Amino acid sequence: GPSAGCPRLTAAALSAGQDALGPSSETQELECALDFLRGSDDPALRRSSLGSRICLHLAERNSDPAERARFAREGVERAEAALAQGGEDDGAVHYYLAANLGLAVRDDMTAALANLHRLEHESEAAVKLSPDFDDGGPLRLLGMLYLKAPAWPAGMGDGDKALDLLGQAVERHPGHPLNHLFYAEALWEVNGESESRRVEEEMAAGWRLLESGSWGYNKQIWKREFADLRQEIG
């Protein structure tokens, strides 16, 4: 449960203050809130995406793959709990279920393939219910799945749908670094050398947002993803 040094907390205060917690929060602050809500019977909090989101913040800040996956697996459990308690209409619950599930499996091919249907279902639910959440996060997840899943007809993989969704994320939510990064990856992988200028400009814009914006402890893992695309394009 909450550690002994945590501030006094109530469900009402956590709900009212839920947006004061984020990627810039220190780990101790995030865990005080996460450990509290696991034990809370407050109907709203029990249905909320907050616990799953906190787990994703903790996953993203951990460079070790096993440690990151451990927190991501906790986020999957928190989102599943929220859905069982009545959060099914909340697009953010499905979003953080799919985002955490992705982190938990994407470094392991067997697990990624084994969870592709669940990822697809949850990413689609997020896109249906709250496509704009987290600056278009659900479009990011579903678009990347269209880019990375086994290619049609073997699976849902479809580069045109990837480009449609990730282009829509960039158009509708230009402030997020990963909308530009992921769109750039799709442009390169689906269209190749003919989109090099656009790929590069999208990378550069994402990097500028990454460097200037306030992404807290998400910055290091996103920087690694930017480097990955740089190396992929040569």
Residue numbers in the entry: 27 to 260
Sentences from the paper on this structure:
The aerobic methanotroph Methylococcus capsulatus was the first bacterium shown to synthesize sterols, producing a mixture of C-4 methylated sterols that are distinct from those observed in eukaryotes. C-4 methylated sterols are synthesized in the cytosol and localized to the outer membrane, suggesting that a bacterial sterol transport machinery exists. In this study, we present three putative bacterial sterol transport proteins in M. capsulatus that exhibit remarkable specificity for C-4 methylated sterols. We first used bioinformatics to identify a cytoplasmic membrane protein (BstA), periplasmic protein (BstB), and outer membrane associated protein (BstC).
Finally, BstC is predicted to be a T-component member of the tripartite ATP-independent periplasmic component superfamily, which comprises periplasmic lipoproteins implicated in the cytoplasmic import of small molecules. The structure of BstC was also determined by experimental phasing to a resolution of 1.9 Å. Two monomers (RMSD of 0.656 Å for all Cαs) in the asymmetric unit form a dimer with 180 rotational symmetry. Each monomer adopts an all-α-helical structure with 12 α-helices in total, designated with H1 to H12; 9 antiparallel arranged helices (H4-H12) form an irregular ring with a pore running through the center. Three cavities are found in the center of the structure. TN1 is closer to the N-terminal face of the structure, while CA1 and CA2 are proximal to the C-terminal face and form two open hydrophobic pockets; TN1 exhibits a mixture of hydrophobic and hydrophilic amino acids. All the sterols were found embedded in the hydrophobic cavity (CA1) lined by Gly128, Val131, Arg132, Met135, Ala138, Leu139, Leu142, Leu145, Leu167, Met170, Leu171, Lys174, Ala175, Pro176, and Phe208, with the hydroxyl group pointing inwards and the aliphatic tail pointed out. The simulations reveal that the substrate moves approximately 8–9 Å further into the binding site and the polar head makes a hydrogen bonding contact with the side chain of Glu86. Mutagenesis to convert Glu86 to Gly and Trp to remove or reduce the potential interactions with the polar head of the sterols leads to ~4.5 and 100-fold decrease in the equilibrium affinity for 4-monomethyl sterol. Size-exclusion chromatography coupled with multiangle light scattering (SEC-MALS) analysis shows that indeed the purified BstC exists both as a monomer and a dimer in solution with a ratio ~3:1.
